[PDB]
């Protein structure tokens, strides 16, 4: 039972890191002359999460 619970938490953490890698690779792939760039509303804000390193 304990091993089942630990594997559930590790599955959630793995999903979070895969989605993170994907968004960061998209943000790297953006460059100049790209059709998705625009001026964004409040880009310097800090969201409610605000985890530190």
């Amino acid at each position: 039972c304990l091993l089942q619970e630990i594997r559930q938490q590790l599955n959630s953490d793995h999903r979070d890191k895969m989605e993170t890698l994907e968004i960061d690779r998209g943000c790297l792939s953006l460059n100049l002359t790209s059709p998705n760039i625009s001026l964004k509303v409040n880009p310097t804000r800090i969201p409610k999460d605000s985890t530190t390193l």
Partner: protein
């Protein structure tokens, strides 16, 4: 003699002023295009931040 000397000098100054006006227009348009390029870099930074906030 005095009148024609002054006339020649005034046309020489006309020539030099016209050349300066032309080259200053060229520098004005180069400055104006670099404004819009810096605006493009600003848009890129804003969308990188709001991309990472998801």
């Amino acid at each position: 003699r005095e009148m024609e000397s002054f006339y020649s000098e005034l046309k020489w100054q006309e020539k030099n002023t016209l050349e300066e006006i032309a080259e200053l227009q060229g520098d004005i348009r180069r400055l104006e295009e670099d404004l819009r390029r810096k605006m493009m870099n600003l848009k890129l930074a804003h969308t990188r931040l709001e991309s990472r906030t998801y």
